[PDB]
Structure 1
Amino acid sequence: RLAAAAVKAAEWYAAENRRKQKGGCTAPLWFDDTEQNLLAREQHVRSPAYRELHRPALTNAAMGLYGGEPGFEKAHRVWVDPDRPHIKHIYNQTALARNLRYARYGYFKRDMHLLDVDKLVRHARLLPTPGRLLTDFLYQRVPLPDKSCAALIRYQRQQIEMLEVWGRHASFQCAVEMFERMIVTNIPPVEVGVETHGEMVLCAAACGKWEEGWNVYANRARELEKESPESFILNTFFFDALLTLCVAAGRVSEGIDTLEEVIKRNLRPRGTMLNKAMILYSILGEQMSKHEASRLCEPEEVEKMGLEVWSLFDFYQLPRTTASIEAYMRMCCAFNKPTLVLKAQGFADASDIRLSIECFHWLVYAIRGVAGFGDYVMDVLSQLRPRGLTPDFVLFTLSFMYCALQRDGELALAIFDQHFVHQNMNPTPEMVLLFIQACSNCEEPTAVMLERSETLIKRLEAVGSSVDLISPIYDQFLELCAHLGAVASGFSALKRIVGFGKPLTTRMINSLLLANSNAISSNGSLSMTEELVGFFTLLKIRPNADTEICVNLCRDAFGESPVVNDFIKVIGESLQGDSEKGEAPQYDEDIPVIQVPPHELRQLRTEWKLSPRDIVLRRFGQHTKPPGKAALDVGSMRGSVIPFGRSPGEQL
Structure 2
Amino acid sequence: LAAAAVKAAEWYAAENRRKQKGTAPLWFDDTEQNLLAREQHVRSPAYRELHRPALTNAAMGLYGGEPGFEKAHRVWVDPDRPHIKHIYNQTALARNLRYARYGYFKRDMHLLDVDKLVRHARLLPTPGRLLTDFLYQRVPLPDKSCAALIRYQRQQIEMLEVWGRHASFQCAVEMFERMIVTNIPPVEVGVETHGEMVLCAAACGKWEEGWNVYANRARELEKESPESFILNTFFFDALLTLCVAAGRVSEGIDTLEEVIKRNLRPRGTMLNKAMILYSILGEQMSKHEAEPEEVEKMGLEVWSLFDFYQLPRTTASIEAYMRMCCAFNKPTLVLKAQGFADASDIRLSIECFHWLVYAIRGVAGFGDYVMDVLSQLRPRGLTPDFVLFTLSFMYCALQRDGELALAIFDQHFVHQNMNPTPEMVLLFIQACSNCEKPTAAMLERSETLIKRLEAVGSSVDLISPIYDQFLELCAHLGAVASGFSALKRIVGFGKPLTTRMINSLLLANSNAISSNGSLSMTEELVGFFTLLKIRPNADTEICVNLCRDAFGESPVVNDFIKVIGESLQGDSEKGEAPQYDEDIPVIQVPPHELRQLRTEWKLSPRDIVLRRFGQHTKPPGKAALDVGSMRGSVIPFGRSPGEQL
1:479 aligned residue (449, 472, 483): 472
1:535 to partner: Cα distance: 1.2
8 Å CA contact retained: 1:247, 1:276: yes
CA distance in structure 1 between the partners assigned to 2:381 and 2:640 by the alignment = 63
Seen in structure 2, the aligned counterparts of structure 1 residues 56 and 280 have a Cα distance that, compared at 3 Å, is: same
For 1:20, the equivalent position in structure 2 comes to 19
1:547-597 residue CA offsets vs partner (Å, 9 max, x unmatched): 000000000000000000000100011111111122432100000111110
CA distance in structure 1 between the partners assigned to 2:39 and 2:259 by the alignment = 27
1:638 to partner: Cα distance: 6.0
CA distance in structure 1 between the partners assigned to 2:101 and 2:369 by the alignment = 55
Seen in structure 2, the aligned counterparts of structure 1 residues 277 and 538 have a Cα distance that, compared at 3 Å, is: same
8 Å CA contact retained: 1:348, 1:355: yes
1:234-274 residue CA offsets vs partner (Å, 9 max, x unmatched): 11110000111000000000000000000000111000001
1:626 to partner: Cα distance: 0.6
CA distance in structure 1 between the partners assigned to 2:623 and 2:411 by the alignment = 56
1:628 to partner: Cα distance: 3.0
1:351 to partner: Cα distance: 1.6
1:637 to partner: Cα distance: 6.0
CA distance in structure 2 between the partners assigned to 1:413 and 1:204 by the alignment = 48
1:178 to partner: Cα distance: 0.3
- Provide the TM-score with structure 2 as the length reference: 0.99
CA distance in structure 1 between the partners assigned to 2:289 and 2:209 by the alignment = 33
CA distance in structure 1 between the partners assigned to 2:136 and 2:626 by the alignment = 49
1:487-516 residue CA offsets vs partner (Å, 9 max, x unmatched): 000111110000000000000000011000
Most deviating of 519-528 and 88-97: 519-528
8 Å CA contact retained: 1:195, 1:237: yes
CA distance in structure 2 between the partners assigned to 1:234 and 1:485 by the alignment = 72
CA distance in structure 1 between the partners assigned to 2:296 and 2:341 by the alignment = 21
Give the CA RMSD over aligned residues: 1.1
1:422-480 residue CA offsets vs partner (Å, 9 max, x unmatched): 11111000000000000000011000001000000000000120111000000000000
Task: Indicate the SS of the match to 2:165.
Answer: helix
Task: Indicate the SS of the match to 2:91.
Answer: coil
8 Å CA contact retained: 2:568, 2:577: no
1:144 correspondence with 2:137: no
Give structure 2 stretches of 5+ with no counterpart: none
Give structure 1 stretches of 5+ with no counterpart: none
Task: Indicate the SS of the match to 2:592.
Answer: helix
CA distance in structure 2 between the partners assigned to 1:347 and 1:73 by the alignment = 60
CA distance in structure 2 between the partners assigned to 1:639 and 1:197 by the alignment = 70
1:375 to partner: Cα distance: 0.3
Seen in structure 2, the aligned counterparts of structure 1 residues 146 and 650 have a Cα distance that, compared at 3 Å, is: same
1:633 to partner: Cα distance: 8.7
Task: Indicate the SS of the match to 2:503.
Answer: helix
8 Å CA contact retained: 1:199, 1:241: yes
8 Å CA contact retained: 2:425, 2:466: yes
1:634 to partner: Cα distance: 8.0
1:309 to partner: Cα distance: 0.8
1:13 to partner: Cα distance: 0.4
8 Å CA contact retained: 1:575, 1:585: no
Seen in structure 2, the aligned counterparts of structure 1 residues 248 and 638 have a Cα distance that, compared at 3 Å, is: closer
1:307 to partner: Cα distance: 1.0
Task: Indicate the SS of the match to 1:387.
Answer: coil
8 Å CA contact retained: 2:275, 2:324: yes
Task: Indicate the SS of the match to 2:623.
Answer: helix
Task: Indicate the SS of the match to 2:379.
Answer: helix
For 1:86, the equivalent position in structure 2 comes to 83
Seen in structure 2, the aligned counterparts of structure 1 residues 635 and 291 have a Cα distance that, compared at 3 Å, is: closer
Task: Indicate the SS of the match to 2:589.
Answer: coil
Task: Indicate the SS of the match to 2:624.
Answer: helix
1:109-162 residue CA offsets vs partner (Å, 9 max, x unmatched): 000111100000000111000000000001111000000000000000000000
1:230 to partner: Cα distance: 1.4
CA distance in structure 1 between the partners assigned to 2:451 and 2:69 by the alignment = 77
1:61-100 residue CA offsets vs partner (Å, 9 max, x unmatched): 1111122111111010100000010001110010000000
For 1:374, the equivalent position in structure 2 comes to 367
1:636 to partner: Cα distance: 9.6
1:631 to partner: Cα distance: 3.1
1:158-204 residue CA offsets vs partner (Å, 9 max, x unmatched): 00000001110100110000000001111100000000000000000
Identity value in percent: 100
Seen in structure 2, the aligned counterparts of structure 1 residues 632 and 348 have a Cα distance that, compared at 3 Å, is: same
1:646 to partner: Cα distance: 0.9
CA distance in structure 1 between the partners assigned to 2:484 and 2:380 by the alignment = 46
Seen in structure 2, the aligned counterparts of structure 1 residues 638 and 114 have a Cα distance that, compared at 3 Å, is: closer
Aligned length: 644
For 1:262, the equivalent position in structure 2 comes to 259
1:286-341 residue CA offsets vs partner (Å, 9 max, x unmatched): 00000001xxxx11110000111100011100001000001000000110000100
8 Å CA contact retained: 1:82, 1:123: yes
1:330-377 residue CA offsets vs partner (Å, 9 max, x unmatched): 000110000100000000011201000000000000000011101000
CA distance in structure 1 between the partners assigned to 2:410 and 2:87 by the alignment = 51
Most deviating of 631-640 and 194-203: 631-640
1:379-407 residue CA offsets vs partner (Å, 9 max, x unmatched): 00000000110001000000000000000
1:206-227 residue CA offsets vs partner (Å, 9 max, x unmatched): 0100001100000000000000
1:540 to partner: Cα distance: 1.2
Seen in structure 2, the aligned counterparts of structure 1 residues 487 and 642 have a Cα distance that, compared at 3 Å, is: same
CA distance in structure 2 between the partners assigned to 1:450 and 1:639 by the alignment = 75
Seen in structure 2, the aligned counterparts of structure 1 residues 208 and 636 have a Cα distance that, compared at 3 Å, is: closer
CA distance in structure 2 between the partners assigned to 1:173 and 1:639 by the alignment = 65
1:444 correspondence with 2:441: no
Seen in structure 2, the aligned counterparts of structure 1 residues 185 and 557 have a Cα distance that, compared at 3 Å, is: same
1:627 to partner: Cα distance: 2.6
CA distance in structure 2 between the partners assigned to 1:10 and 1:290 by the alignment = 37
Task: Indicate the SS of the match to 1:175.
Answer: helix
CA distance in structure 2 between the partners assigned to 1:416 and 1:637 by the alignment = 62
8 Å CA contact retained: 1:194, 1:235: yes
8 Å CA contact retained: 2:122, 2:613: yes
1:640 to partner: Cα distance: 1.9
Most deviating of 141-150 and 59-68: 59-68
8 Å CA contact retained: 1:33, 1:267: yes
CA distance in structure 2 between the partners assigned to 1:12 and 1:630 by the alignment = 75
1:629 to partner: Cα distance: 3.6
Seen in structure 2, the aligned counterparts of structure 1 residues 145 and 638 have a Cα distance that, compared at 3 Å, is: closer
8 Å CA contact retained: 1:439, 1:445: yes
CA distance in structure 2 between the partners assigned to 1:485 and 1:59 by the alignment = 88
Seen in structure 2, the aligned counterparts of structure 1 residues 583 and 538 have a Cα distance that, compared at 3 Å, is: closer
CA distance in structure 2 between the partners assigned to 1:357 and 1:325 by the alignment = 12
8 Å CA contact retained: 2:13, 2:24: yes
1:104 to partner: Cα distance: 0.4
8 Å CA contact retained: 1:578, 1:585: no
8 Å CA contact retained: 1:481, 1:487: yes
Task: Indicate the SS of the match to 2:260.
Answer: helix
1:27 to partner: Cα distance: 1.2
CA distance in structure 1 between the partners assigned to 2:169 and 2:84 by the alignment = 39
CA distance in structure 1 between the partners assigned to 2:351 and 2:261 by the alignment = 33
1:46-71 residue CA offsets vs partner (Å, 9 max, x unmatched): 01110010011111111111221111
Most deviating of 64-73 and 401-410: 64-73
Seen in structure 2, the aligned counterparts of structure 1 residues 397 and 635 have a Cα distance that, compared at 3 Å, is: closer
Seen in structure 2, the aligned counterparts of structure 1 residues 162 and 635 have a Cα distance that, compared at 3 Å, is: closer
Most deviating of 411-420 and 573-582: 573-582
1:603 to partner: Cα distance: 0.8
CA distance in structure 1 between the partners assigned to 2:251 and 2:372 by the alignment = 41
CA distance in structure 2 between the partners assigned to 1:163 and 1:638 by the alignment = 54
